[PDB]
Structures are given as structure tokens and as C-alpha cells.
Design a protein around this ligand. Structure first.
Ligand code: MG
Ligand code: MG
Ligand code: MG
Ligand code: MG
Ligand code: MG
Ligand code: MG
Ligand code: MG
Ligand code: MG
Ligand code: MG
Ligand code: MG
Ligand code: MG
Ligand code: MG
Ligand code: MG
Ligand code: MG
Ligand code: MG
Ligand code: MG
Lengths: 64, 128, 396
RNA sequence: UACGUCCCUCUCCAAACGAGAGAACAUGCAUGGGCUGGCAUGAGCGGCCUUGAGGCCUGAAAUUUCAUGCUAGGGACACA
RNA sequence: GGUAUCGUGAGGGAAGUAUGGGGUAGUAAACUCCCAUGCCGUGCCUCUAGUUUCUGGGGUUUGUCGAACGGCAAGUGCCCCGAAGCCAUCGCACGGUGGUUCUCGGCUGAACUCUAAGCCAGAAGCCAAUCCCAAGACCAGAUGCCCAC
RNA sequence: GCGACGUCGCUUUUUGAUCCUUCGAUGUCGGCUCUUCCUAACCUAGCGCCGCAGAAGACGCUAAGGGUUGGAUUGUUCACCCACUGACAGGGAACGUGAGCUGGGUUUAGACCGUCGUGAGACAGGUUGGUUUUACCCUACUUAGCUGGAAAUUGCGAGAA
RNA sequence: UUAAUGAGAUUCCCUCUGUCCCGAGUUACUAUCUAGCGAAACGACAGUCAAGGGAACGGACUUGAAGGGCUAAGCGGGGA
RNA sequence: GGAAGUCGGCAAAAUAGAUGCGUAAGUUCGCAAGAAGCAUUGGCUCUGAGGGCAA
RNA sequence: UAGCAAAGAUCUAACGGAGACGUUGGAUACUGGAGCGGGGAAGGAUUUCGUGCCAACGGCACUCG
RNA sequence: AAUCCACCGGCCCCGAAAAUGGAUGACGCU
RNA sequence: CGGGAACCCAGGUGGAGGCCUGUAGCGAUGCUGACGUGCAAAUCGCUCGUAUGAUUUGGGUAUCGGAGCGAAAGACUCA
């Protein structure tokens, strides 16, 4: 019952993260989830998850 | 009513997410607020406020009118324990009784404002 | 004319340092002789907090629906060793003690409480009471006052202390025993000593005192802040930026008459470290020790294996090793300060205070961080054999 | 010459200073290991990315368990 | 006598208060409750947010150590992130009790009605109580331990 | 519910007197801030009562317990609107409150203007610019200690909830 | 009447913000404690209140109510 | 959130260098004007020209 | 007791000394060429220098001035 | 075998109230 | 000067100005900042005005008490 993060794909156990509804559209989910404010402050800056060594997708690219 | 954190003190310029012509919602005063001393009347996510339009059509400008907050750029902790917030403040412009008044909303109306206004949810593209 | 509601509460004056850190119930519940003899208080140690997720009841709007995150407090509660029995006369100047029978043995941590050094001392505390108890006149002079606790007594109070050698917490730097009289609220005082006389010199564990889904009142001593100013101690106001001699003050603390400063105006002094009570704090789980059940925090919907102790202990406290009690919300302590539970005063008959509870989730994610991992065996699953253990689990 | 208390040291749920809560071969202190957590891939090298969620920091106004290291016992009244 | 622990509690303080909702019920309308919210109060730091002299880790800027490494200077260079701690009606928890009387509905009827005596009853109110302080209220409260002369 | 006509008690945030205190100095209004107090009750609270069928108002009494807002213009008090609200009641505290703040109005020395005056100048007319010192003392309060103490330090003086 | 000029007076708008709603955390330097050094202004005596009367708003009088003593940090009510 | 603070945007923020593009009202034609307003900025390897000494 | 809070942070060795002081070494700094620089006028007139000294003067102290 | 129609007279009831706590001088007296 | 029967369209050159930004210099607007038993019998901080000029400054030299001198505040003339 842990909705996985958006920008770093962490596990967000209930009551820890801070969700976010961008003024935009999404058929998938209108609300974005972020475990750490680092994960979000680095998303208004809008890096990509890959190219960031500690995120999860990087651990699908840098792991092979 | 809900335990929504307050975001929009009196004198805040909310923008209009309702295709009625207006662009701004300079918050005149919160409808329902019980006065406290030196405390600025602060709108919240579900609150209905009184407004003057500061930008948009003139057929509604120099006039005090109502509005319901759609979106809140201040993170309120949902009672389910999920702290959630928006890109931008937003409010529909509404009937003095409370009615939709304006073309269906161009934004993700929040849960705390739909189940306090059965006339907004029926015009909102998404609920969040 | 114009005014505002007054700052702070006049019923907590003077804002004074409590006379002891030990939380002490000033009043015990009303003696309902229609109940069974029991213990109405218990001393726990504030481990820290966490939060949990609950299946909600009590049909409302936020209730009778999906779950809720409610913050809780973990209070480690080792069993208390009863040592004495104390009875009171109901005399017209208020209760007075009419003797105190002690146990024949008296734990070495209890006797530290009657000292302040105990290691340069000669440890004579309770020497002529262990000796004189093995006598016959001892047994006489002991049943002479037990046969008094029924003639003259109305209020019967065992003396319990805490087990701290059974509390392997080190950050509780103290090795004395916290001593607390505990009311018995049964009936027929003749049968009230019968309980007291029975469980004397036996450990009293917290679930024997309390039940799971019911609420207590938490007599405790607030976290101290030293001398706090007027804006922090009373929360009055800050003067404008333009003020001379600074702005964190009360401007007018007196009219011309009365020509004395009142006890009501706000002034700077001891804030915090006050004795508070926190009526109606509701227990959500009273789970037992890891030595007996190393699956504390796994109720029914977290079929994984874990304990209450978060990843990396509670910050500034340690691991919980004893019969913790899980309350709901705040408790007026810093970490490792003794709290005293108490069965409550309020009528407590309500659909918001007498309803039973199941906990669908508890958080063991570390306090020290942000924690994204429960049950550190989940952290190992996220990572891989990184170079720390790789330099040890591949170098053999 | 008693039981004891106090100072000195240490600890910190306490603290402006007193006072308080403590300990006084104890897990006490000091290091290290481990955990937990921050940061975000270390000097150097191979072919710029690779070693590599690396290096570093992590109790210190004072996060948590394990290994090794050292570890005042003297004063002042009490006391006549 | 000292010292120590546990209490007693005279006395002083005193606080919770508004609003909406559902409910039965367009009922010869409210009322135990069920539900929130707001304010006040007392707390707290699990979460969220703020805070950074962990100058933690990183980045960067001029100068600067022969150059890297590494630093340093810019009374903390600036910047991103940042645990701990502190803290927010920015977060969170908690704050629904017994008598007494008067307005008063009323009882008996005297000398027919409530009162002249005999009387229930109850909103506030006051009063204790919960709550905060605590014997200069000098506690013949209880209790632990002990001298010399 | 008051109104003719009227009158009669008690009223101060009242209009002025009085000249009693102060001329080897009680520092000027308004605010800010904070505490208190009163009821002549604005709100909630308690019945009462009507041409008080529900609705909803209507009059009244009891209660100081709690509550009584945010702004625009003004130095303001007041006033006025704006909007919320259950309603935004009225007062005292040296017109509560400057060794607390502020310095907008009073506010002098500069300057301009209007009227006045021969002129210097005057105006309680307008405009602009214009010091705001000291607690380290006693008590009050606020917290923080310590120590004596029952013929409240003494007689041996003797009283046990 | 006027372009330019203005530490001139004034009003609005934009931006911007802790001016504020509503405050919070951090930092030096102080205050705090210490070693050394060390003033002064001021000073009848002093110095708990309420009420009374009074040169009519008392620290002393009257009548009550508190008050053991000595203290450190504050504060700014009073000592017209 | 953005002057709701306050007698008053007081204070603080903000603005900012350079270069390029633009730049109104008014006007004593000089100005206003740095108007307003946008835009680009790094580090690096380069490739361009820009000059003194003769058949 | 107020205070000795604007302006540069002293740290160490071994040496001297009757003893926080001085000297030397090393260290980290500060002034930063409109200087805690080197020279002059005005003014001061022995304040220069060395060797002592350390009573009171250098608002702390001093073996130094 | 008592019971009336009108008034004179108060003691005494209301008429009537403020703002530090509060005064016959205090307790207290009925 | 380019370029086209009048004198406009532009390109440079040059470096004016009681012009602008700004250092010193000289001033002292705001904070009604900090001090107000000062560092100081008027200072300190930041801001700020000006900064080729009717400028600032040195020394010398003139004019002084019912007087001098003043871009004039009855300012200044050894606190
Ligand atoms: Mg000021
Ligand atoms: Mg410490
Ligand atoms: Mg102690
Ligand atoms: Mg370690
Ligand atoms: Mg330690
Ligand atoms: Mg009591
Ligand atoms: Mg009482
Ligand atoms: Mg005033
Ligand atoms: Mg205002
Ligand atoms: Mg005093
Ligand atoms: Mg004198
Ligand atoms: Mg005192
Ligand atoms: Mg004092
Ligand atoms: Mg804006
Ligand atoms: Mg300048
Ligand atoms: Mg010369």
C-alpha cells in the first residue's frame, strides 16, 4: 500500500511523502508523489531521473 | 468542512479557473469567517470568498462578487495523512447562494471543494 | 470597547519548574466500590513518537471510510515491582498515612532511591527493616498495621518502583528507582488490602493495569526551555519593527492604578518543565517485549516481521526492549522522561472514546532520516552488495 | 569517630548563574566497527566513464547497538 | 538532631467557548446524541513546512598556496541539498463534572393560589472537584537510615 | 412600543465654571501593545409573553459567564461606507497605558500663503520641514535559589485531628 | 503655463518583499558566570496593600488585609 | 499571501554589470532616456580578421 | 554594580624571569601601496637612543612601555 | 359571632446602577 | 565627409558641458538606526547629496564688538 515515487521511484509509505497536483493533465495520475523535497526541488528544476546517480531509473541504466 | 490549511489571506490575488471572462480574484473577504483580532481573513481550499475582479471582462469588474477556491498553492495535510498542493491558486466565480456561474473549470478541482459544492464537480475536468 | 481574548491560561500559574521530573498523579480516580481491586496508575518512559495507519470506525465523513494516519507515541513500560502498602485515614484535615508495610526483600535499585551517592555509602537503607522483618515482633508489628489498614484506612496505595536493570536503556542515565504510590480503586477495603497484600513484591506489568483500546491520562513533566521571554512563554505579540529597546515585549504591563504590576500580565521566566496531565490519551496498542514476541509492529496487514524500534532506534532514546505502550498523539515529555499513566477521570462514555481499534500499519521508517524503508531487510532489497559489505562478504 | 549530605570531575530529560536529573569500575569515557541517515560518484588509474549509491560526514547542545582501550578518591561540614 | 523518600493539601490560581452538520422531522420547531470545523488553552515533533555554524556533502566565484590533490582568504564568498535540534493554527495531540440555589414552572392550604410555616424542581449562577502551585497552614503525615560526647 | 401636556429621580466618554493641589516641571491628543473592570445585555444562555398554527418575527425579564472582526479615506477620538459575522453593545481604569513604542496632530526656532497691521509682527487660519534622555536604586510583578524557624529565633512555657 | 532638474510635498500603479497575517530558526557582539579593573547620576527617611478621611489619587494617619529572613536574573507598574 | 502593516512602502527586498534589440507622453528640440521594455551571458577546442621589419 | 561589547583571532615550543609578561623560532593571520607603510609642514620638544627599573602611570596585566 | 366599605403613620418591600477588593471603623450582633 | 538645380539623408572625427554614473574630497537625506553616566560637551553605522566646479584645500593676508562678515539661517566671529 505504498505509492511509489514519481521522480526517484522510491517507496512512499503512507504519511511520509508530500504529494503534488501540477496544473496540467495526466491520464495516468493527476497527483505526483515525492518522498523528499530534494526529489521535488530537483523536479521543478526538471532533471531526468536517469542522469542522476541515486534515483531508480539510473539504476536501470547504470546497472544493465 | 475540512481541516484545510489556510493559504489566501484577505487581499490575495487568486486567478480565475472558470471560463467566465475574469482573470483575477482579489480576495475581498472570506464568507463564513468568524472574526478574530488582527487576524487577516484567510481563505482555504473549500472556502467561498467574496471577490472583485482585477483583470478580465468589465461586465463583472467594479463589483463585489463571490468565488469558491478550486486550487491551493499551499500544502494542506489531508486527514488521510497525504500532504498535497497545487501549482497555482485558483477559484471559480460563483452565485451569491452558491452556483457554478461560468464555463466548466479549466483546472484540476480539489476534493475539498467538490464535496462542499455539488455544482462545481460537475464542471471540473479532473478531481484531485 | 475593542479588546481581544486574553493570552495564555491563568490556571497554569505560576509558570514554575515542577518540583520533580517524575510525573505524579495529583488525584486518582473516584473510588467506585462496585469494581474489582486493581491498580490505577503506572510509570512508563517516553521512548519517542511515530505514526500509524488505522481502520476507522464511528460513522462520520472522514470516518466510516478509508484509513487515516494518526501520530502516536511509544512509551516503554517495564513491569513495576511493588514494595509497600500505604493506607490513609480520612481525617478532617485530609488524608494521613497510617503506616507502611514493606516487602521482605527490597530491590537494590529501590534502595538507591534513598541515597544520592550509594557507592561511597555503606548501603544501610532498609537494613533494620530486613532484619526486623525476619523477627516475630516484626510479623506482629506488620499485621498490627495491616489489621489497621482495614479499621482506619479508606485509601490504600501500594508503593511501586520501576525496574531499570530490566530497562537496558542506557540513555536513561539514572539507576535509582522511580517510586510512585498507586491508588487501588476496588471496593470493600478489607478486600482492597487483599489485592495489595497479594501482589506485594511481585512485578506488575502494564497490560495488567490497562487494556488495549481504552484511554488513560498521562501525568508528566513538560520539556523545559529555561527562561523564555514574553513572546515565547505567553505568546503575546511582537511589537512593530520600529520599536526602541527591541520588540519582544509587552508594552503596557500596568495602568496607573493599581500601581502594582498584576499577576495576569505576561513576563519572562521558566517556560517548560511544568507538570501537565493530558486527559484522555487513548491507547492504541499495549504490545509486549521483543524478548517474548519479536514481532511487535506486525498486526495483521503487515505480515512482514518487524518491531516497534525504528531503523536506527528512536532518536536520542535507543531500542525499545520492554512492554511498550502506544498512546495517540502528544505526551508532555522529552525522550527518556518518566511518564505516569492514570486511568481517566472523565465519564468516558462516548462513541469517540470507547470505540475499539485495529491498527492496519505502523511506521518503523527511521526517525534519524527521512526514512523510506521499513524493516531494514527492505533496505537491503533496494540496494545490492555495495562496497561496504562487498569488501567483507567477498574478501573471504 | 557513625549514617550520611556537599564540593571537585563526569553525564544531560535540566540550566542565565544557583538549582535540577544523574553516574560515581558503570559500558563510564575514548576510539573503531556495524546500523541509521546526509551527500551524489571521490585522489588515483584503465578504456573522457570504469572501477563505484563511490568518497566523505553521522553525536558533537550531546542518532542507535557492537569490539578494544584507558579508567583521580581527594576534600568540606556532619562533628561536639 | 541530621539526612532521605513517599505522601497529605489548608490556601491561592482556574478555562474552555462558539458555529455548522447529520439525525428523528414540513411531524397540535427544537431536544440525550452522532459528526466536523473555528477560536482559545496545554502540549508535542511522527509527518509536512520553515530553520543550518553537522560551514555535513556537493557546486561555483575572485585571490591564493609552483601546479594539481588539497585547501585557504572574501569577519560563514555565493549557491544546491542537508540530518539533529528547535519550531508553525504552516504540522499534531488533547481540553463533553457533581452538587447548590434564584429567575421559574408548581404543590398544600391556611388566614379560594406558590408560601404566612410545610415543599419538589431545575438553564445559568455560585460552590467545591478534575486542573496548576504547595506547611511561614511551620504536617504529632508515614517512612529509610544513623553518631561522638 | 413609546408620543400630546408634562413633570419628577439619578446620570458622565458632558457644556462650562471654580481657582482648592501643582510654576526650584504630575511631558502634550491618537494610537500600538497588554491587563483589568463594570452592565445601563450587542451576541450566545434561561424561561416568560402577543392578533407567538409550523416558519418567522414580536415584546419583554434573568444573567458580566464567554464572545464583540478585517479593511478604505482621516493624525484622529467620532463619523462614514466596504465586507465577514451569532453580533460586530456601551464604559471605567489619571480622557487605563510614552524612564513601553510611535511621532501622525498639537510643533516653538526655517519658510510660504490668506486676512490683519503704518511697521516689527499677529491669527486658537492653512502648508511644509522640525529633540522623544536616564532604571544600575526601593517596591510591584516574574521566575530562580538559600536559610532559619512553634513564647514565630527567647523561659526550662508544659496543649499531639 | 511650463521641458529639464529635485535627499522638496503628494497620490496611484507595477515589481518586490517578515511591513504585516504570524511569527520561527541561525549567527557574531553583548547581556549571563568568572579573573582583573572599576565608576557615576542620584540619596530626608524610606519603601505590602485596599478603604476612609486629608492641601480633596498616602510609604508613614485611621481601620482592615497580607508580610520570616536574606537573595541572583529580569522587567518597567508605581515610588505624583 | 503580498502593503491587508503604518500618519506614511518607514525599513527591507527588489533592481543591477556588459552587449544586442527596442524606447512613448510631453517638450524650451537640446532632452525625456539607462525611458519603459525585452534578449544573450559559462567553460572549452577552434576558425576569422585586426600589425611593425624587403628583393 | 553599570560596565571594561565599534575597530586585527593568538597558537605553540624553550628561554628568560621572584612569578598572566617579554624575547627568539615556527605556525595562522591582519593592515593591503588613499596602509597599524616610509618621509615632511602645522603643532608638540626629548617623546629619540641605550642600559636599568616596575613604586604609580599605560582604564586588564606586565619581566614591557 | 363576627365580618366591612376610606384613609392617616411608618418600621419595612420594591423605585435605585456602576468600574482594584471593601467597609457602621473591624469583627460581629438579630 | 560619403550621396543627390536649393540644402536634407546618413558615416566618422573631435571631446564641450555650473551634464550624468562614480573614487577621494567636500557635504549630511533617511533610518526619526546605534549611542544618549557617549568613543564623542554632536560621535558611529548604513543609506544618501555632490564630485571640472558659483568646487575643495594649505599657508599668508585683510574686516570684529553699540562691530565684523554673511548665496541671509538674525547664521558665524576660539565649545
Ligand atoms: Mg525608534
Ligand atoms: Mg552541557
Ligand atoms: Mg542532585
Ligand atoms: Mg563510529
Ligand atoms: Mg558523550
Ligand atoms: Mg485544592
Ligand atoms: Mg480552594
Ligand atoms: Mg497617549
Ligand atoms: Mg489598519
Ligand atoms: Mg522586590
Ligand atoms: Mg541631591
Ligand atoms: Mg525578589
Ligand atoms: Mg532586582
Ligand atoms: Mg506580485
Ligand atoms: Mg559620496
Ligand atoms: Mg608654514
Amino acid at each position: 500500500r505504498t505509492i511509489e515515487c514519481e521522480f526517484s521511484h522510491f517507496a512512499v509509505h503512507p504519511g511520509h511523502g508530500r504529494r503534488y497536483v501540477p496544473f496540467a493533465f495526466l491520464s495516468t495520475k493527476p497527483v505526483l508523489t515525492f518522498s523528499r523535497p530534494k526529489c521535488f526541488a530537483l523536479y521543478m528544476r526538471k532533471k531526468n531521473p536517469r542522469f542522476i546517480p541515486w534515483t531508480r531509473t539510473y539504476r536501470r541504466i547504470h546497472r544493465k | 468542512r475540512f481541516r484545510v490549511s489556510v493559504a489566501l489571506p484577505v487581499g490575495a490575488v487568486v486567478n480565475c479557473a472558470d471560463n467566465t471572462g475574469a482573470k483575477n480574484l482579489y480576495v475581498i473577504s472570506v464568507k463564513g469567517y468568524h472574526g478574530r483580532l488582527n487576524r487577516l481573513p484567510s481563505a482555504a481550499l473549500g472556502d467561498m470568498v467574496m471577490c472583485s475582479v482585477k483583470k478580465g471582462k468589465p461586465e463583472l469588474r467594479k463589483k463585489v462578487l463571490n468565488a469558491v477556491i478550486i486550487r491551493q498553492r499551499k500544502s494542506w495535510r489531508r486527514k488521510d495523512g497525504t500532504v498535497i498542493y497545487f501549482e497555482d491558486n485558483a477559484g471559480v466565480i460563483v452565485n451569491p447562494k452558491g452556483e457554478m456561474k461560468g464555463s466548466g473549470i479549466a483546472g484540476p478541482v480539489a476534493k475539498e471543494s467538490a464535496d462542499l459544492w455539488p455544482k462545481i464537480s460537475t464542471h471540473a475536468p479532473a478531481i484531485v | 470597547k475593542f479588546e481581544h481574548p486574553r493570552h495564555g491560561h491563568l490556571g497554569f500559574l505560576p509558570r514554575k519548574r515542577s518540583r520533580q521530573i517524575r510525573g505524579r498523579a495529583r488525584a486518582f480516580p473516584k473510588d467506585d466500590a462496585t469494581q474489582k481491586p486493581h491498580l490505577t496508575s503506572f510509570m512508563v518512559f517516553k521512548a519517542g513518537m511515530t505514526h500509524i495507519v488505522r481502520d476507522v470506525d464511528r460513522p462520520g465523513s472522514k470516518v466510516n471510510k478509508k484509513e487515516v494516519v494518526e501520530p502516536v507515541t511509544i512509551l516503554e513500560a517495564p513491569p513495576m515491582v511493588i514494595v509497600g502498602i500505604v493506607g490513609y485515614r480520612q481525617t478532617p484535615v485530609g488524608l494521613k498515612t497510617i503506616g507502611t508495610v514493606w516487602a521482605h526483600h527490597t530491590s537494590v535499585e529501590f534502595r538507591r532511591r534513598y541515597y544520592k551517592n550509594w557507592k561511597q555509602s555503606a548501603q544501610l537503607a532498609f537494613s533494620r527493616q530486613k532484619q526486623f522483618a525476619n523477627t516475630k515482633e516484626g510479623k506482629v508489628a506488620e499485621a498490627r498495621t495491616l489489621n489497621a489498614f482495614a479499621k482506619k484506612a479508606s485509601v490504600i496505595r501500594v508503593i511501586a518502583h520501576t525496574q531499570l536493570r530490566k530497562l537496558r536503556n542506557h540513555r536513561v542515565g539514572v539507576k535509582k528507582a522511580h517510586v510512585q504510590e498507586i491508588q487501588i480503586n476496588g471496593g470493600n477495603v478489607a478486600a482492597k488490602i487483599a489485592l495489595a497484600k497479594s501482589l506485594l513484591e511481585k512485578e506488575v506489568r502494564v497490560d495488567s493495569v490497562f487494556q488495549q483500546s481504552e484511554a488513560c491520562d498521562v501525568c508528566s513533566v513538560t520539556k523545559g526551555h529555561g527562561t523564555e521571554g514574553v513572546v515565547k512563554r505567553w505568546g503575546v505579540a511582537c511589537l512593530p519593527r520600529k520599536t526602541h529597546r527591541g520588540l519582544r515585549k509587552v508594552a503596557c504591563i500596568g495602568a496607573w492604578h493599581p500601581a502594582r504590576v498584576m499577576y495576569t500580565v505576561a513576563r519572562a521566566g521558566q517556560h517548560g518543565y511544568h507538570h501537565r496531565t493530558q486527559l484522555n490519551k487513548k491507547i492504541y496498542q499495549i504490545g509486549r517485549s521483543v524478548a517474548v514476541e519479536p514481532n511487535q509492529a506486525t498486526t495483521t496487514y503487515d505480515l512482514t516481521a518487524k518491531t516497534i524500534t525504528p531503523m536506527g532506534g528512536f532518536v536520542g532514546y535507543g531500542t525499545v526492549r520492554n512492554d511498550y505502550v502506544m498512546l495517540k498523539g502528544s505526551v508532555s515529555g522529552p525522550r527518556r522522561r518518566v511518564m505516569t499513566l492514570r486511568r481517566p477521570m472523565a465519564p468516558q462514555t462516548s462513541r469517540h472514546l470507547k470505540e475499539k481499534i485495529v491498527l492496519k500499519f505502523i511506521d518503523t521508517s527511521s526517525k534519524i532520516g527521512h526514512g523510506r524503508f521499513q524493516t531494514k531487510k527492505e533496505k537491503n532489497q533496494w540496494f545490492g552488495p555495495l562496497k561496504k559489505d562487498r569488501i567483507r562478504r567477498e574478501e573471504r
